Ligand binder design. Structure first.
Ligand SMILES: CC(=O)N[C@H]1[C@H]([C@H](O)[C@H](O)COC(C)=O)O[C@@](O[C@H](CO)[C@@H](O)[C@@H]2O[C@@](O)(C(=O)O)C[C@H](O)[C@H]2NC(C)=O)(C(=O)O)C[C@@H]1O
Ligand SMILES: *[C@@H]1O[C@H](CO)[C@@H](O[C@@H]2O[C@H](CO)[C@@H](O)[C@H](O)[C@H]2NC(C)=O)[C@H](O)[C@H]1NC(C)=O
Ligand SMILES: *[C@@H]1O[C@H](CO)[C@@H](O[C@@H]2O[C@H](CO)[C@@H](O)[C@H](O)[C@H]2NC(C)=O)[C@H](O)[C@H]1NC(C)=O
Ligand SMILES: *[C@@H]1O[C@H](CO)[C@@H](O[C@@H]2O[C@H](CO)[C@@H](O)[C@H](O)[C@H]2NC(C)=O)[C@H](O)[C@H]1NC(C)=O
Ligand code: NAG
Ligand code: NAG
Ligand code: NAG
Ligand code: NAG
Ligand code: NAG
Ligand code: NAG
Ligand code: NAG
Lengths: 55, 387, 55, 87
């Protein structure tokens, strides 16, 4: 979530994946999002890999 | 976005023109150039090519650009054609014929011309050669070029120098890795001590060219002159005093002459366009049609700059706060709203032009139509549709 | 070369600038020289590839 | 092992002197570090997303300081300084 000034200079950027705070920050395109509940769609679950199916 | 140019026009129009003996070598790689602007800027007179045509340059891309540049003498103009057995093609510069090349004949004004004369040889300059003391605007051109081995010094041993009472040959001590002469006495009672050496009286006309230390070497492509002919007996330390090394005077060398390029207050300079890698490469001409014309407002002129295609009306709005590399500006959604030219440092705001509809009311008992243009002015409709 | 290395312009160097066998001119896709402000303190780089296009 | 041609054959050893120094400063993109300007697109007073390539924060810098003083070892090649440049 890159923020540009009046002269087009980057000052603050949101990671969107460092923690849940970055997700809520870049979910509404604002450095300070409004109050309320935020259902984080895309939460990390860290699953396992499954391959080579056997008959 | 555009790429930096090769700056060929800045090199061809250089005031420091070189002599035909030492042509300037310049290679252009990974850049762009315009043939039309180059030909319009230079004062060209003729354009010829070998196994190629100027019409095939448009579309085909070459691997690299190789150019040649040297002054053209006034008396040596009729022998510049390919295949001519003149003095220039025999000892000054060789023109390749088995590869695709182009010949450019352009002229430069006589004023602001600085000549540069320097022999591109090792043994010629190392064996006592000072600066080329010539007149202004003097085009020097060699006639006969000779080559020597890497183990031959143009001098002999001091033991035989003192053995001749009259017409003794000068000698000194050349560095290690060199061979002396083979002087011998042939007294036939004509003088007190008549002794002669090899390559006499001159290397061009010798009775035994096999025993001569230097032979006539023809010039080749991409190789300058091997050196002028010098007599072994005409140079060296007299009486073998052992003062300096085997150094020879500049006046001992022969086989060159000079001319001038003063013709209608202008000088001609030859240009060889050596091109390689037909229809394959990176650097080549880009004379195609590009959207770089005289832009103007009051009409939605088509814009195709910076890889973005759209239709819109340009508007002159001052914008100096842009960065040194910034060329455009986008909106919140991500669509183009303007740009900035990189050749005139001008900024424009793109406004979409009229593409709306028109309302027409019709009645069953009527014949005409009540056309109504929503959100428009009568002047715009009259100046953009019809009368 | 199997053992590449580069030299410095200040004082001397251990070896010479010879880490290849470029006896002629090769073919490059981008060959030019750009000068940067040497008086600065930091320098950030970025090199990522997408669809076979270098950056 | 990186090269495919032989140039030098003297003053070559195999002494273990490599040091995989890891930095103690993590990636901080809150002040524009790591963020790269778009190749041609430019935005003014806009906070728009960009699914580009940025370094992951919370990851310490891996220092690669390699030099040579009249001698060089083949040990620095491959593991551990030369890593697989994935993307
Ligand atoms: C990553 C690391 O540990 N770097 C060392 C560096 C290398 O171990 C070494 O130079 C590479 O050569 C091999 C493979 O042995 O060595 C440094 O110390 C040198 C140890 O030899 C040091 O004594 C230097 O020795 C010289 O003889 C030389 O030129 O090799 C003289 C030189 O003045 C001296 N360098 C000094 C005092 O700075 C090194 O080169 O600095 C130590 C690094 O940390
Ligand atoms: C090159 O970099 C140096 C240092 O990064 C710049 O010098 C600084 O200029 C500002 C402007 O007034 C001063 O406040 C600093 O004190 C200067 N620092 C130093 C170390 O001199 C310099 O301006 C840069 N030049 C360009 C052309 O960008
Ligand atoms: C070369 O020396 C380095 C430096 O000691 C060795 O790296 C160490 O390896 C041990 C074993 O895994 C670790 O416990 C240390 O933490 C490592 N130290 C550092 C600074 O990385 C390395 O193993 C040596 N290599 C060989 C082949 O002997
Ligand atoms: C940059 O964007 C901000 C965000 O919209 C603009 O701030 C708004 O400005 C208008 C007019 O001055 C106000 O009515 C809004 O209340 C402002 N929004 C907020 C959140 O304060 C700002 O004007 C823009 N700057 C430029 C130069 O376009
Ligand atoms: C040739 O001139 C046109 C005219 O603006 C320009 O767009 C183009 O980039 C030029 N090509 C070059 C310099 O290679
Ligand atoms: C070229 O010649 C003109 C007229 O003699 C002179 O005014 C001008 O300064 C010269 N330019 C250069 C670069 O020598
Ligand atoms: C345009 O702006 C750049 C940026 O400072 C400047 O270097 C250049 O001289 C200006 N003029 C032209 C014709 O490019
Ligand atoms: C149209 O003209 C006919 C002609 O007789 C008339 O009868 C009818 O009423 C008219 N209708 C309207 C809507 O004017
Ligand atoms: C590099 O090569 C030159 C020419 O052979 C030599 O004079 C010089 O000493 C060399 N330098 C090193 C560091 O080997
Ligand atoms: C940079 O490249 C140009 C090519 O036009 C060359 O003439 C110049 O010598 C180069 N300068 C350096 C410092 O490499
Ligand atoms: C260098 O490599 C070539 C090709 O592998 C080989 O023919 C040659 O013998 C090698 N020379 C040395 C000194 O290792």
């Amino acid at each position: 979530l890159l923020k540009f000034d009046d002269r087009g200079v980057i000052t603050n950027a949101v990671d969107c994946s460092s923690s849940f705070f970055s997700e809520i920050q870049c979910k509404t395109k604002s450095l300070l999002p409004n109050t309320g509940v935020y259902d984080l769609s895309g939460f990390t679950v860290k699953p396992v890999a499954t391959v080579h199916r056997r008959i | 976005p555009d790429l930096p140019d090769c700056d060929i026009d800045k090199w061809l129009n250089n005031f420091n023109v070189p002599s035909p003996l030492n042509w300037e070598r310049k290679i252009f790689s990974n850049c762009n150039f315009n043939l039309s602007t180059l030909l319009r800027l230079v004062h060209t007179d003729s354009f010829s090519c070998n196994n190629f045509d100027e019409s095939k340059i448009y579309g085909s891309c070459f691997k690299s650009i190789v150019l040649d540049k040297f002054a053209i003498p006034n008396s040596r103009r009729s022998d510049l054609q390919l295949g001519s057995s003149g003095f220039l093609q025999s000892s000054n510069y060789k023109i390749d014929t088995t590869s695709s090349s182009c010949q450019l004949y352009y002229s430069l004004p006589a004023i602001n011309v600085t000549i540069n004369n320097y022999n591109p040889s090792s043994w010629n300059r190392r064996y006592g050669f000072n600066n080329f003391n010539l007149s202004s605007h003097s085009v020097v051109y060699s006639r006969y070029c000779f080559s020597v081995n890497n183990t031959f010094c143009p001098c002999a041993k001091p033991s035989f120098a003192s053995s001749c009472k009259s017409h003794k040959p000068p000698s000194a001590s050349c560095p290690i890795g060199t061979n002396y002469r083979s002087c011998e006495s042939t007294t036939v009672l004509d003088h007190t001590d008549w002794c002669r050496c090899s390559c006499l009286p001159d290397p061009i006309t010798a009775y035994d060219p096999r025993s001569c230390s230097q032979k006539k070497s023809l010039v080749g492509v991409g190789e300058h002159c091997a050196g002028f002919g010098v007599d072994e007996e005409k140079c060296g330390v007299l009486d073998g005093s052992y003062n300096v090394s085997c150094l020879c005077s500049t006046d001992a060398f022969l086989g060159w002459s000079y001319d001038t390029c003063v013709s209608n207050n202008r000088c001609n300079i030859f240009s060889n366009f050596i091109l390689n890698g037909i229809n394959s490469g990176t650097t080549c001409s880009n004379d195609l049609l590009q959207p770089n014309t005289e832009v103007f407002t009051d009409v939605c002129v088509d814009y195709d700059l910076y890889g973005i295609t759209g239709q819109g009306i340009f508007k002159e709005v001052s914008a100096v706060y842009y960065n040194s590399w910034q060329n455009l500006l986008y909106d919140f959604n991500g669509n183009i709203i303007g740009f900035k030219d990189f050749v005139t440092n001008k900024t424009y705001n793109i406004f979409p032009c009229y593409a709306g509809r028109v309302s027409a009311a019709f009645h069953q008992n009527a014949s005409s139509l009540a056309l109504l243009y929503r959100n428009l002015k009568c002047s715009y409709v009259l100046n953009n549709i019809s009368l | 070369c199997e053992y590449p290395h580069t030299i410095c312009k200040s004082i001397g160097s251990s070896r010479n600038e010879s880490w290849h066998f470029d006896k002629s001119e090769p073919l490059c896709l981008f060959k030019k020289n750009f000068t940067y402000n040497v008086s600065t303190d930091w320098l950030y780089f970025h090199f990522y590839q997408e669809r076979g296009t270098f950056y | 092992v990186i090269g495919d041609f032989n140039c030098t054959n003297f003053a070559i050893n195999d002494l273990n002197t490599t040091i995989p120094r890891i930095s103690e400063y993590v990636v901080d993109v809150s002040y524009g570090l790591g963020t790269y300007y778009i190749l041609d697109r430019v935005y003014l007073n806009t906070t728009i997303l960009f699914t580009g390539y940025f370094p992951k924060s919370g990851a310490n810098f891996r220092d690669l300081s390699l030099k040579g003083t009249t001698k060089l070892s083949t040990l620095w090649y491959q593991k551990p300084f030369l890593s697989d440049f994935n993307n």
